[PDB]
């Protein structure tokens, strides 16, 4: 698991993981607080 972790550190895998996480928290914010046109405050 020394080269597998290095493989997971490559640009495509890291970008896919980061974009999946990013889309995930964006989608979940929009699920829990939907239809947010202005700042909540």
- What is the binding site for other proteins (CB under 8 A)? 6, 9-11, 14, 27, 30-31, 34-35, 37-41
What is the distance between the alpha carbons of residues 38 and 28, in angstroms, rounded to a whole number? Answer: 18
CB of 2 to other proteins, least distance (A): 13
What is the distance between the alpha carbons of residues 6 and 11, in angstroms, rounded to a whole number? Answer: 10
DSSP character for 9? T
39 contact choice in ligand CLA, other proteins, none (CB below 5 to 8 Å, kind-dependent): other proteins
Give residue 33's Cα distance to chain centre: 18
Q: Which residues contact ligand CLA (rule: CB under 6 A)?
A: 20-21, 24-26, 28-30, 35-37
């Amino acid at each position: 698991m020394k080269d597998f972790l290095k493989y997971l550190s490559t640009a495509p895998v890291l970008l896919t993981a980061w974009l999946t996480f990013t889309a995930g928290f964006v989608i979940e914010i929009n699920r829990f607080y939907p239809d947010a046109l202005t700042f909540p405050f």
